[PDB]
A paper describes a structure:
[name] is an essential molecular chaperone responsible for the folding and activation of hundreds of ‘client’ proteins, including the [name] (GR). SHRs, including the [name] (GR), are hormone-regulated transcription factors that depend on [name] for function throughout their lifetimes.
In this Article, we present a 3.01 Å cryo-EM structure of the human GR:[name]:[name] complex, revealing that [name] directly binds the folded, ligand-bound GR, which we demonstrate is critical for [name]-dependent potentiation of GR activity in vivo and in vitro. The complex was stabilized with sodium molybdate, further purified and lightly crosslinked. The folded GR is stabilized by [name] at three major interfaces: (1) Hsp90Src-loop:GRhydrophobic-patch, (2) Hsp90CTD:GRHelix1 and (3) Hsp90lumen:GRpre-Helix1 (for labeled structural motifs). [name] engages the closed [name] at three major interfaces: (1) FKBP52TPR/H7e:Hsp90ACTD/Hsp90BCTD, (2) FKBP52TPR:Hsp90BMEEVD and (3) FKBP52TPR:Hsp90BCTD. Unexpectedly, [name] directly and extensively interacts with GR, with all three [name] domains wrapping around GR, cradling the folded, ligand-bound receptor near the GR ligand-binding pocket. There are three major interfaces between [name] and GR: (1) FKBP52FK1:GR, (2) FKBP52FK2:GR and (3) FKBP52FK2/TPR-linker:GRHelix12. However, in the GR:[name]:[name] complex, GR is rotated by approximately 45° relative to the GR–maturation complex. In both complexes, GRpre-Helix1 is threaded through the Hsp90lumen; however, in the GR:[name]:[name] complex, GR has translocated through the Hsp90lumen by two residues, positioning prolines (GRP522,P526) in the hydrophobic pockets of the lumen rather than leucines (GRL525,L528).
Residue numbers in the entry:
A (entry chain B): 15 to 225, 283 to 706, 724 to 732
B (entry chain A): 15 to 225, 283 to 701
C (entry chain D): 16 to 424
D (entry chain C): 519 to 777
Write the structure that this text describes.
Amino acid sequence: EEVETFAFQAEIAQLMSLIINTFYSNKEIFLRELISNSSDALDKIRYESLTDPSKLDSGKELHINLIPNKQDRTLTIVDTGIGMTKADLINNLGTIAKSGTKAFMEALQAGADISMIGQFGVGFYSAYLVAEKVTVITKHNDDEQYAWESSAGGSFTVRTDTGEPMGRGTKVILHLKEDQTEYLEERRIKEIVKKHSQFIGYPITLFVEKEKYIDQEELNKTKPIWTRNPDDITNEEYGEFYKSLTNDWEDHLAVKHFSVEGQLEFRALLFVPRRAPFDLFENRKKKNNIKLYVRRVFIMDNCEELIPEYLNFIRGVVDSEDLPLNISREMLQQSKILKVIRKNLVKKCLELFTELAEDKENYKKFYEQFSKNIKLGIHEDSQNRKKLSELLRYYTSASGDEMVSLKDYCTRMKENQKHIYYITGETKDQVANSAFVERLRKHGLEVIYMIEPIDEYCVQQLKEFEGKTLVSVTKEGLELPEDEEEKKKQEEKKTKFENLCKIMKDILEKKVEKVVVSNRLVTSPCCIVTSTYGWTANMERIMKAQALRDNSTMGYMAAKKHLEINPDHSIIETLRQKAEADKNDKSVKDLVILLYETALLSSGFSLEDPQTHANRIYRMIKLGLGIDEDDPTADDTSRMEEVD
Amino acid sequence: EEVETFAFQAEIAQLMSLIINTFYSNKEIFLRELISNSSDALDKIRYESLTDPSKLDSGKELHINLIPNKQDRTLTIVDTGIGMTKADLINNLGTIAKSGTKAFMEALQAGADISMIGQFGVGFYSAYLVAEKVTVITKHNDDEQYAWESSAGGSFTVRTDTGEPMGRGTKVILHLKEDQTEYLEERRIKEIVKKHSQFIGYPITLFVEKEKYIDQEELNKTKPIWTRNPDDITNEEYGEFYKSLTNDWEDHLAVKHFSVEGQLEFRALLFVPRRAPFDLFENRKKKNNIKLYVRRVFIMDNCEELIPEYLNFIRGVVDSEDLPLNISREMLQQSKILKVIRKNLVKKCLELFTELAEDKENYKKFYEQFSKNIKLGIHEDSQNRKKLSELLRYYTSASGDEMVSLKDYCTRMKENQKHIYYITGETKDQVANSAFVERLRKHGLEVIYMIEPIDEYCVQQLKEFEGKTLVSVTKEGLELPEDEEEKKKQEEKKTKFENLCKIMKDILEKKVEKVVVSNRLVTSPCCIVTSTYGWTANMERIMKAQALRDNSTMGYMAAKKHLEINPDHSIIETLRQKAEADKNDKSVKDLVILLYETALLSSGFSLEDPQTHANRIYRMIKLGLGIDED
Amino acid sequence: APLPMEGVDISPKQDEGVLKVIKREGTGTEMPMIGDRVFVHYTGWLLDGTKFDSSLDRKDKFSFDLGKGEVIKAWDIAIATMKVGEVCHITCKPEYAYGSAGSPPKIPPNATLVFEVELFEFKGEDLTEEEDGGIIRRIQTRGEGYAKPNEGAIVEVALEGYYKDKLFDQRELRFEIGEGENLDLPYGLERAIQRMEKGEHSIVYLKPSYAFGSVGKEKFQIPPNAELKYELHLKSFEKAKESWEMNSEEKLEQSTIVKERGTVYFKEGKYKQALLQYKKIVSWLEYESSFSNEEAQKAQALRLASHLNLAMCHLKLQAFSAAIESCNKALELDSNNEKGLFRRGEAHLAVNDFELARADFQKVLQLYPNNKAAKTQLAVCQQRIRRQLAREKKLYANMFERLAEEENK
Amino acid sequence: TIVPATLPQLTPTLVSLLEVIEPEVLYAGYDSSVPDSTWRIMTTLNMLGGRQVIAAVKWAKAIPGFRNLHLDDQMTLLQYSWMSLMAFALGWRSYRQSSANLLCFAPDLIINEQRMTLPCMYDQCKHMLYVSSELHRLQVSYEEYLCMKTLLLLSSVPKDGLKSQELFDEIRMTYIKELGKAIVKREGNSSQNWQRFYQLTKLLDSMHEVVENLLNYCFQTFLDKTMSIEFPEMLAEIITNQIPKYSNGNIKKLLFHQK
Ligand SMILES: Nc1ncnc2c1ncn2[C@@H]1O[C@H](COP(=O)(O)OP(=O)(O)OP(=O)(O)O)[C@@H](O)[C@H]1O
Ligand SMILES: Nc1ncnc2c1ncn2[C@@H]1O[C@H](COP(=O)(O)OP(=O)(O)OP(=O)(O)O)[C@@H](O)[C@H]1O
Ligand SMILES: C[C@@H]1C[C@H]2[C@@H]3CCC4=CC(=O)C=C[C@]4(C)[C@@]3(F)[C@@H](O)C[C@]2(C)[C@@]1(O)C(=O)CO
Ligand SMILES: [Mg+2]
Ligand SMILES: [Mg+2]
């Protein structure tokens, strides 16, 4: 058939408007773009002088000057880079999607040390976000000095300059809009510059008129150091960098500097601070303090995808030279990249901690600040759970005041220690003196003391260490490596007190699930234990105390209480004899309740109504003191025989 | 000096690359854009047919068809809109940033009821995010059918179409990239359409093959009822909209249909669920629930800037014409706009809650699920405490099982009250039977019972209600407007009881700050109270369970404990007499500790030993049973 | 590891696939009977050394009901042929396992399986309401069909048996279930006949709570609280109509008859029988039924009478706690019932709940100021308390002084 | 200056609690050499049913939340769903043991197509087999299964409501949430989870058809006397108590999802 063929066209007027109004969300970036263009201009001249030094005959200092002018509502940026010839000036600034730097890089041969920022061709025009008019003055070594002028009117002009020679380089003058004058203030400048530039290879000097004279203040004093081989960096150097980066008067605790090669190129510095921040779990700004740079230009911060939350205390920098960006250069074009970055950053953080742990003194300093984060990692990171667990330290019944690892536990333990025993509670003293661990102490078994509330969750998730499961000494069914003779004696004793098992349950029918004869008590007449499933003491108080929780769940998850009796206590034996003689003896009923309430307190449970515990005691005190009974106390017949 | 003047030009090859590779953040978008172009095509003809009905002689049903074809690895979109003339294929598709839609709108009479999506002139090319080649077939009423083709190589072609007649409309055929074929799946297409374009006015039908026959499913079955006048919408209609919107099965509890007509214009529907909402399935935790649409097209759904977190259980839609958008049309330009929207959404939510409060039964239903959020809003966002506090309800010592407002408490205050009394604790019952409220009950004063852990945070902001001061009944220095005769009696008795204060200050020196003679007590021999400035027992027990605890704050927030003595109690008088007779009587040393320990428990403090307490009891029991020492 | 089971022959006549294997010898005691719950070791190997995962891998003894077919046949037989302490590993022939089913994941179809069985102990069936072991059944040879007799059923059973070390001779019994005294037999045989299948042949053992009680007679040389065992053969029965198929009429009619019968039993001192009769009211009328208002009122009167008399029976039977529950039910129906309230107070005094006893006698007088007995009760309750208080005062008279001394030794 | 702390999410154990609660598969049967008379199969299954049904009661009593409902409500829920639960239990065992159209009732007895000699099985096995087929097709996990079984217990109420209604409603949301987790845990997905959910909610809602069609045959078998069928006394009782609730339309179906 007949086919007509056409080239694509573009409407310049609309295209110009889109660049100005729809590509960028934050006007402050105009400065970023102008600075980046200048740093490229400087790299290109540097590259050329590398093989032919005469290129710098026109001047050797490579630097960027920022010169605001209040009086004219203008801002001038001056570099000392190559500059542009008349032909380039027209072709590169007059063509909306052309890029001279891209062409330059294409011209360059492999092995060049040149890394340039840009390739899109539309960045310059961002000047019009704040400028009314833009003037560009430039001098190239091979041409006359020329002045370019425009506004986004759809045309532009070129004339020969008549002013002072620049020697070489490009000078960009913005004439600002009346309401954009905030960009002429020194404070605002410096804030923008610090945020978006910072690691530019050339110095930036800001020229400020003061009480007049010009105060020449240099920015970019801190150099990136991640670019250096780590072998070559001293600890002092890392420390100074760190302090500058975080405005932290204190040094780092630890640092990991590494690189990744292949597919995605990386360099990164990860620092561990010596103090956890007070707002570590409270600040509402995004938690990951990792800044992402591309070709040393800041791109993104506060990115959730880079690091799992449990590691939100690591401070650091990630820098790459090959990731795709969107048009505004404010975010990555493809999210799968972040998936990879995250995998590698986590892997190396764990290596750092593992190594850190070999130094016991330093590990203590570390653990004391960040043990909370490790524990959260146990709950959430299902892949590194088997590595994170080796970083845990606990006080135990053996260990005096030292905290020990789980590995340490498991080498001191005994041939019959098929299980790892632990107890949880509010504080070390209460736990240490608990009835629940006395039998274990008697036989020389070690018990791990878990104190922080968070531990209640970790034990769920942990289950076992090297094949040995964890068991709670506060639950029913605790297995001890008892002798067979001991087991037989314990069973013989169950043929006794049968009546108390029943009587006590009846007294306390509405309060407990079971009354049983036990063996974990070698002190105390009784204790309360929880059945194998459901919330235990501590788990319940913690949940009840949360600021924001649905209490409807407490109608499902609750302890089932069993009361354990020590048959070799004198109270119990006396009650057996007394109760068998008279099961309705009122004094038995009252003392059984008192023992029950006492057991709840000693076992870690609160009382339903503490007042009526207190009243029982007060009554006994009054009798004990001889308080006269005057205050403690006040002191047809066949109808009910009817058979119906 | 002669000055040369130049026009600006553009490099087409690079321009095309930027549009395809670095404008769009995702690939879902290509469908989003093609559908929007079709709805505009349909509106243009619909409009013209209003003055000249013959425009529809070529076909009257206005609709959009989606037809995937796995065998050819293609996807075809067919509209029944206005179509394009040969001249338009060249001018509108061959020119970047040209927009026919924009020109059309400019040419309209000012009162035309037209709202169209588009003005930038680049969305068409988003097709190349997933296509290798694009073919467009079109029929306009005034011209022949033509076929446009391009691989986006910097040229395109136009041929006379020699295939089947269309009658009228535009058919876009995408030849998909070999490696992006999930877009041919029924599942994927439905997901995308529902997310981005379910409120497009014309029906969209998806055609797929199954056991075979073609199953023709309409996807946009729900209408954007927010465009209707609110007075014409029944509750059943709102309820159905709500369920459809949220994939609920439960109805809505309340709805506010609101509009704004100022510098900004928008409409919104805000719904209150009958059950607190929850993340049934994986989503971003703490995602908010207000979705923002422009001209019935979805823009974004988790913009924190839109509404405070305490109101994140409101579900809803904001639909606003004329907001400036980003080239990707995924983000709003000029965020100051969101600030304004937020102000208005909050204002109206508060009015809605106020209205619910009129219906006592429904308010209870509300409050039972959402009282936490109200409380958070007291703590946070202080400018609204003045309204939020009136939505609070509490049990009090005078309400039985009803919860009442602070206004009811105020109504019932005695003329001698300048203070509102409250107590905090763990349960209803533990508070109700507390020694601390016994005297207040004696004098007929009402006490508010605060129960939830959150109440402790909240109470620190609500210092005043209608000019009255809020005070606690478990602290040092509690004022009760009693006659001075009682003060005189205490001064008369302190002369004999200070001797115990001194003895008891030596006992327990390391445990309490002081021992004083008091009057808040009636029947217990003693109690433990908190200092005027400091933290209460309830504060300590909750701080201890925060899990994500600091250390310096635990030392810092520890309570100071003061012991108060009831002089009139028989135990205390017996104690005075024995203690004076012999300061070092061992029986006194132990009686004092026992009373102390008991007082902590009844006062709400955890007993820290706790084993010693148990042991003291065990000895008492042994004597009670007649068990000797050996 | 797997055993060389291929070296073991088949148990005599066990064409049922049961292996003649002994690894451990037993205690020499007898075999379990049908229905006995035999507590056993259970582990093993499946075809060709496949590990068998079971309850004794964690030492959890399995409770097995012999002769009911709840396990594969070879296992059931091994229990029947094994003594306590004996250990067998049975190469169950496939037909006596899962056959061709191939019960996945671990049983190949037509697989020979090796099960390790040990008997630890056994008991007969508990035929009682509570696990007291009051009625124990050991099935001898028979029982078929799924029907069983119930209260009101007419039952034909042959009974022969023992008491102490002497025998009851054989007699044929044709009777209505629940008429224990007109059999002049233990209460337990009612409860036991009610669980028998047609043709059933079994031995039933009775402890004193089911064994002859106030039904016991010197003519059999049997005291109340007798030690008994009987051999029963159930031949037939006429099952009584059940409440789920009964009319509202029939429920009231039968409840009325029962009230009258219960009244008589109570008066005759047959309190257990009276109790058993009054309970019949309760299930007919508590069971959901649509009654007319007149019928409902009659039902309410009957329900109240049961609950009041049940409490009365419980008081006579010293079940004071039960008396509390039954009188409470009576009081739910009638909150001012003088008898229910008075009796609740008595039950409380009976177990020294003095304060509660007083609360009830005080209420009786508030409603019935002329209940002279409530005054008498109330006064006793008060004095009983006073006496105890005096004892406590003495008990703790020098409590603090003694503790002060103990604490310093 | 003191603000609330955030908390980690506590992991629910409702599925593992259910794993512990669940009863063993019960044995029942007759020697296979005995002819498969239609009535013999049925009587055997009725006896099996009786035992399984009572096991289901203690199973229910042991369930968190449910156990705190007024006893009358507990009995009501058990009656209305007893067939849903038994049908679901059969479908599971069947499909897990085999992809074939088998009804695996007990380790002792499996009915293949040629043994379905009862007109009811010829007509209704398509539904019994449907459930097995769907569980097979959908590759249903055990965690999802348990969550669903619990929800079936909670699938219907009297039209007049429950006494502890405001607890019932809690329990229902509680287990809906647990099922949602059972789904997330096997999928690892986002939007697919709602779709998986509806694939499964539709079962639970279609189960009402499965039950009513079977229910009518169950009632016909019990009430008429066409075969030598013995019933457990407990089934005779539930059947006559349940027939009028059903036939009078007093049972409200709670259908989770429509569309
Ligand atoms: N100060 C300067 N000195 C020398 N050449 C310059 C200067 N500023 C701009 N140019 C030239 O103008 C071209 C256009 O630059 P512009 O900043 O618009 O785009 P870019 O940097 O190529 O793109 P991007 O938006 O990706 O940064 C450059 O490629 C370069 O050749
Ligand atoms: N299906 C269609 N029927 C008729 N005209 C169409 C169709 N699709 C595109 N056009 C025409 O081609 C032009 C191309 O518009 P395009 O979608 O690229 O930009 P747009 O609508 O401004 O989208 P955006 O603002 O998102 O870039 C339209 O203005 C319209 O005149
Ligand atoms: C087809 C129906 C459905 C049947 C039931 C389906 C569910 C079920 C699963 C089992 O694992 C054991 C028994 C039962 C519980 C059942 F098999 C029997 O009760 C008989 C039954 C009601 C039925 O066979 C009759 O209508 C005959 O009464
Ligand atoms: Mg640039
Ligand atoms: Mg468009």
